[PDB]
Ligand binder design. Structure first.
Ligand SMILES: [Cl-]
Ligand SMILES: [Zn+2]
Ligand SMILES: [Zn+2]
Ligand SMILES: [Zn+2]
Ligand SMILES: [Zn+2]
Lengths: 310, 310
């Protein structure tokens, strides 16, 4: 029977790109009856990627059991709360990911291929080369885009030396110029004007427990920090509501400039002294500039973590 | 800094073979400073393997922090309670394994290579091949012996079709005949007569919670079932004591004939009706014959699980 292959809830480009590519690879090289599906519709950055290479969005599902599947393959995630609603009721045949492992468990052995690299799509690509399988131009496009999206065009410190090697091979296969296409697709996910502030602060947001404090950390990509900060009133009203509704001790929003690879940090809550101490900066009107920062998990969360435990 | 590579507590041949082999591969292919260590002394089967190929036992450690390690690599296990005592206090850099995932979590991304095949050694071998790293004769021997040990010379239902393809490749590299070396090494772990009955039932034993009931399932390998049962009285006595002292509802001993691939089941406790039902047999004198049974996790435990649940 069919094995469904999917990325996380609130799919990003790497989630869609990795699962679409892996379902193809599995059919071609592993003898598997796989289908790529998605857990949500594409965001604007991914809608652009899909358009550019002329691939339809993988269909959305909400229950793996409803779709007839007894087995699934997860890509770009493993944590059960990031997965399909009924993940505990199906077998995990396999996982291809680049994140920490938590909230994840199986009854039986499985395939796992995890590497601490820039994207799941990087791993999937290298698996096409291992098995001598040709990469269709549109699948190369999708994988390249996964890698560019997760690392902001190889600028993030989550970029591994192997990523820097495969990026030009992927550009060639995809038929694009690396820097030009990369800039183009990243730009497509920076038009936030038509979204409400509530939506904005929940586009890419997670909660971290830091020495007993529930700290919410969101990120948005932009070509212009000032354009985001010019909506500051409604953003602060959304964040105060979020703090009120959810019991967050603190809310930190990363406003990430994709052109210059820096973030502005807009933060509100009980422990602002610890935010200032984490980054050696001074909040003015709830915000300060953080040079070089584009990775939540490498450049903001560990810094807060240390500071909150100090 | 030195990265420690090791298998699980109470190491079997696969644990030591896969950790020794991977520490070498990681130095040659990944530019890592790895050292293989063990969490216990070799059993009698593994000592035979190590003597055959001219390889010293990996030194035993008890604390990764005492050894000055900050990073470790786990082979043949991932469950924290099967690992080094201070596993929570160091970084898991990588895992290579063929078991289910449980009791396992990391703070950061990592390497994982998991496959539902017959041994971790099988996976390590494939990685040598994938990286173009020539396999030293003694390392092929350690890897082969891990596979043969975990699958009873490829007769276990845990054996994967890829195990059957690699075994002859590994035997040629190791310089041995598959069947004859495999039989010799398996016989080296059947020295039951010089163990007491208390030791015997605890050589390879695990507790499985089956619907509130704590069921102890032990296994021993022998060349002669009837010979093991010459000591039936002292085994039953050791068993009755273990049930009493540990509050097991039931105790199942598999006495596995390595020559013919069958087991005798000797069982004692509150739920024998469910044991008989699990296997379509009648227990006479607390035992019965179970044709084909060599794997506890595939041929004994699921059958008891389903039976213990109606
Ligand atoms: Cl297992
Ligand atoms: Zn993702
Ligand atoms: Zn990703
Ligand atoms: Zn083992
Ligand atoms: Zn093993």
């Amino acid at each position: 029977s069919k094995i469904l292959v999917f990325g996380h809830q609130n799919p990003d480009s790497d989630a869609i790109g990795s699962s679409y590519a892996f379902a193809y690879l599995a059919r071609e090289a592993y003898g598997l009856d796989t289908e790529a599906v998605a857990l949500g519709e594409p965001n604007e950055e991914t809608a652009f990627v899909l358009d550019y290479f002329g691939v339809a969005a993988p269909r959305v599902i909400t229950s793996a059991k409803a779709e007839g599947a007894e087995q699934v393959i997860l890509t770009d995630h493993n944590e059960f709360q990031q997965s399909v609603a009924d993940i505990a009721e199906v077998e995990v045949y396999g996982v291809v990911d680049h994140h920490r492992v938590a909230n994840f468990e199986t009854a039986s052995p499985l395939y796992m291929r995890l590497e601490p690299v820039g994207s799941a799509s990087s791993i999937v690509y290298r698996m096409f080369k291992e098995h001598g399988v040709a990469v269709p131009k549109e699948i190369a496009g999708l994988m390249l885009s996964g890698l560019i999206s997760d690392t902001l065009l190889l600028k993030s410190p989550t970029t591994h030396p192997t990523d820097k090697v495969i990026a030009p091979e992927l550009a060639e296969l995809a038929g694009v110029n690396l820097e030009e296409y990369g800039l183009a697709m990243l730009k497509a996910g920076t038009n936030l004007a038509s979204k409400s502030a509530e939506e904005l602060i929940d586009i890419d947001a997670k909660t971290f427990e830091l020495n007993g404090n529930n700290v919410r950390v969101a990120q948005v990509n932009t070509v212009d920090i000032a354009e985001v900060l010019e909506r500051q009133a409604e953003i602060e009203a959304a964040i105060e509501k979020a703090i009120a509704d959810n019991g967050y001790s603190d809310f930190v929003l990363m406003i990430t400039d994709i052109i210059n690879s820096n973030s502005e940090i807009l933060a509100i809550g009980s422990n602002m002294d610890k935010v200032e101490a984490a980054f050696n900066f001074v909040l003015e009107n709830n915000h300060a500039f953080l040079a070089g920062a584009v990775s939540r998990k490498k450049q903001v969360v560990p810094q807060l973590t240390e500071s909150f435990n100090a």
